Design a binder for this molecule. Structure first.
Ligand SMILES: C[S@@+](CC[C@H](N)C(=O)[O-])C[C@H]1O[C@@H](n2cnc3c(N)ncnc32)[C@H](O)[C@@H]1O
Ligand SMILES: C[S@@+](CC[C@H](N)C(=O)[O-])C[C@H]1O[C@@H](n2cnc3c(N)ncnc32)[C@H](O)[C@@H]1O
Ligand SMILES: C[S@@+](CC[C@H](N)C(=O)[O-])C[C@H]1O[C@@H](n2cnc3c(N)ncnc32)[C@H](O)[C@@H]1O
Ligand SMILES: C[S@@+](CC[C@H](N)C(=O)[O-])C[C@H]1O[C@@H](n2cnc3c(N)ncnc32)[C@H](O)[C@@H]1O
Ligand SMILES: *Cc1c(COP(=O)(O)O)cnc(C)c1O
Ligand SMILES: *Cc1c(COP(=O)(O)O)cnc(C)c1O
Lengths: 444, 428
């Protein structure tokens, strides 16, 4: 009855390799120690032409029918084809606004066809929801199959844990979060705490919590939620399919994604590539990966001609989730960027904050990581690589509501060594009709 | 404009042969007698199309990419602002918000299998105000583009309304002004209008000093005011009710619980459900519960008095018509409810905590049955109220037990210690 299936496979598998694993297998790496990927049965999917898939996926966008209302699960056949609908844990994720940045594109970039994907408008406020619905759904299934998974554990700065904990909580799955004691107080770990996660405050840095969550997982029947998981990528790749669908199956010229551990940027390529390969569309977009100057291993690797990649030491950024020294999905990203003929650009602490301020002025509320992405767009316009007329999509990874402090400090002119050129502080005036009118007429 | 549909400003009531009405193109805030204004649609022009027509029309637009019908508000454009040009609309894909099924929360805490929470907080600016602001700003945009004298939009909100207002205005290139007392200025509270390029004024006076001053400016400069009295924002807000129906495949819930501070909201929801009933989409409206804080005004005391002793009359009318109920929630009760809800996956606002407390109390009274289809409206994303959650979960709210707090446990970087803590948790 159900002809579609998926399995684990070594990332970029060698010719005629026989290595595969059932998705029910709890595995994170291959025989060689490399990363795993979800490989779908392309022979079975190709029994249906692009016309069928377009019509099928279109018939399901924003409908009440479970589970196809979700931006991810409307594409179930391409994500987890063999999961039962009873096991799916979904919070209506995806269907995210592809915001037309008319005033930003025209006033700053000379662009008419610039769009911003607001992935931040989600259940936990970041794109990580797309990935967590797939992972927790699969974990949910394993639990019901009486498999040894008593909960999910992770150690990541808010964004990953918030998504995980929320989805785990709704399904009654215990969620275990390891976080450094002083390094984050209680402000940014509010979501997992509120979502009934079992939170531990450890006497170490972020690195020490990452090491300890491994040790725990080695003995305890606790599933490990990491950058490694190819399941998360299966949900995240639907954002690329969604962008296509929102453009009525027309392919944009450029897509710019913030790259931390570099999984997301790869997920986007896989989504775009899958639509081309199955006959939905005839082409794929060119991709741009944007990084913070304080954490630019991919940037240094690209401009060296895809030769010599080095795990650099990352320094403090306002774009917290993007500051990664040794990116886990590095080989994935490099592969993706080569195939789609892509580009990598960096962004300084000042440049990412300024581009963020300029975006907000157009009626947005986007994260510092998005500022990084917009900086890349700024620079590629300068270099003439992105044309003023080209259909360009910038991916906003998180809502600004999760990164308010960086905005409060910027407009308060309270960041040391920062120029804060686009700050918009409140103006002081005494209760006088003439004085109030004059400052308003000057703004008029 | 071969458009059969139309709407106008009309007083809320005035039975004895009133002919008072204003064009939606006029700047007006109140009636001749000072009462509330109301957007009245040409129901006779709408009644020309049967219940099935509107259902199928609204269903065909939902989620789609066709401008402007993708929005949860503008998908019902004919019922909101029928005369505005598509090229004048300022939309940020608002509405379409998750009708989250509270399975774990409903079954474990309330013994309810069909309880839903409507997450309006998942939107552009983090609240349901986006629904109302898209209509207001669109009209203001329409007026400005036809060379009408409107220099900008102003308000005195420190929270949701100003955040929503300034965001929509910024995209349309419409100046946004926030009049506020210099002492009540908060950098955190105003983070959204500040970033959205809104002209925020800090005035060296009190609450009354500002309201007196705005009167003096709006008599000289034509600044459109956004406030609680505004009836144009209700036209957007009402589509949330319509949406709830559409999301249930045009099946009416038994109960819809709305937080009530402003009191305009509960009316908007009533207005939306009623419009669907009156036009043949459905055969009924839900019973509604208005949930108020214990600290809040005497709407609760008025309901308990058997309807004998802003937007107060507006809400009382809506509640009497739909056979509604009002309940209170105390500071501790709403915080507890927020914690319980949150622990099951949600991340809701304190206003939603108030609504859930009203649900709890009415379940205990046996007014709401276990099987009853119940929708609890969440007005704002929990991310706008992290400080109260931080305080609650660290037991840092005085005169409150914080009984459902989930503080993190302290451990050193020792394997055996981390394990023993984990073992006792997994043993539970
Ligand atoms: C209210 S349910 C319809 C009633 C349901 N079929 C029943 O029998 O109880 C449909 C709504 O659930 C919410 N929802 C959340 N996740 C969804 C998903 N993955 N697929 C479809 N709807 C989802 C959406 O807001 C959607 O409008
Ligand atoms: C994106 S507009 C482009 C307008 C103009 N040709 C330009 O380039 O500046 C193209 C079509 O999309 C629709 N549209 C207008 N504003 C939109 C928005 N903010 N988001 C999505 N679609 C929009 C309109 O129906 C219009 O016909
Ligand atoms: C990408 S535009 C369609 C292209 C457009 N016809 C053009 O030629 O430029 C459609 C997307 O804009 C966004 N959007 C925001 N508001 C919308 C609205 N009111 N109606 C339709 N789409 C809207 C949604 O994310 C939607 O998927
Ligand atoms: C409300 S669910 C299950 C109700 C069940 N009779 C009970 O009381 O436990 C009814 C239908 O809605 C769909 N559904 C399941 N989970 C959903 C969710 N989280 N959101 C929206 N619809 C859902 C499924 O297709 C299911 O058959
Ligand atoms: C995790 C995260 C990123 C980084 O994505 P990768 O796939 O790890 O490159 C960027 N922005 C936000 C908001 C994130 O949470
Ligand atoms: C929410 C609301 C208000 C109050 O908004 P705040 O900015 O939070 O004070 C007033 N009137 C109506 C109709 C509302 O919906």
């Amino acid at each position: 009855v159900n002809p579609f299936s998926a399995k684990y496979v070594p990332f970029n598998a060698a010719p005629g390799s026989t290595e595969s694993y059932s998705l029910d297998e709890i595995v994170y790496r291959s025989r060689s120690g490399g990363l795993l990927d979800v490989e779908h049965d392309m022979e079975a999917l190709k029994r249906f032409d692009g016309a069928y898939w377009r019509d099928l996926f279109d018939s399901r966008v924003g409908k009440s029918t479970w589970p196809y209302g979700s931006g991810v699960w409307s594409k179930k056949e391409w994500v987890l084809p063999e999961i039962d609908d009873d096991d799916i844990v979904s919070a209506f994720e995806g269907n995210s606004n592809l915001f037309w940045a008319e005033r930003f594109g025209k006033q700053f970039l000379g662009m008419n066809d610039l769009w911003v994907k607001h992935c931040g408008i989600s259940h936990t406020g970041s794109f990580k929801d797309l990935g967590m619905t797939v992972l927790v759904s699969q974990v949910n299934r394993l639990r019901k199959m009486k498999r040894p998974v008593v909960g999910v554990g992770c150690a990541s700065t808010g964004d990953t844990s918030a998504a995980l904990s929320a989805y785990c909580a709704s399904a009654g799955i215990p969620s275990i979060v390891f976080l450094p004691a002083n390094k984050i107080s209680m402000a940014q770990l509010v979501q997992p705490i509120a979502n009934g996660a079992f939170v531990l405050s450890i006497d170490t840095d972020f690195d020490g919590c990452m090491k300890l969550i491994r040790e725990i997982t080695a003995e305890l029947p606790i599933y490990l939620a990491n950058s490694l998981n190819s399941l998360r990528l299966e949900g995240q790749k639907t954002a690329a399919i969604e962008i296509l669908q929102q453009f009525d199956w027309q392919v944009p010229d450029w897509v710019i994604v913030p790259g931390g551990n570099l999984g997301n940027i790869y997920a986007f390529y896989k989504g775009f590539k899958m639509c081309q390969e199955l006959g939905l569309v005839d082409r794929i977009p060119r991709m741009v990966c944007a990084q913070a100057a304080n954490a630019n291993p991919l940037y240094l690797h690209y401009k060296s001609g895809w030769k010599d990649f080095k795990p650099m030491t990352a320094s403090t950024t306002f774009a917290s989730a993007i500051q990664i020294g040794d990116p886990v999905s590095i080989d994935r990203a490099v592969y993706a960027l080569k195939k789609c003929n892509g580009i990598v650009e960096e962004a300084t602490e000042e440049e990412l904050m300024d581009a963020m301020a300029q975006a907000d002025s157009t009626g947005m509320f986007i994260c510092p990581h998005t500022g990084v992405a917009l900086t890349a767009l700024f620079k590629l316009r300068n270099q003439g690589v992105i044309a003023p007329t080209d259909r360009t999509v910038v991916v906003s990874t998180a809502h600004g509501l999760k990164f308010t402090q960086s905005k409060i400090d910027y407009h308060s002119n309270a960041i040391p060594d920062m120029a804060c050129r686009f700050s918009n502080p409140p103006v002081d005036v005494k209760a006088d009709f003439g004085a109030v009118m004059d400052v308003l007429k000057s703004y008029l």
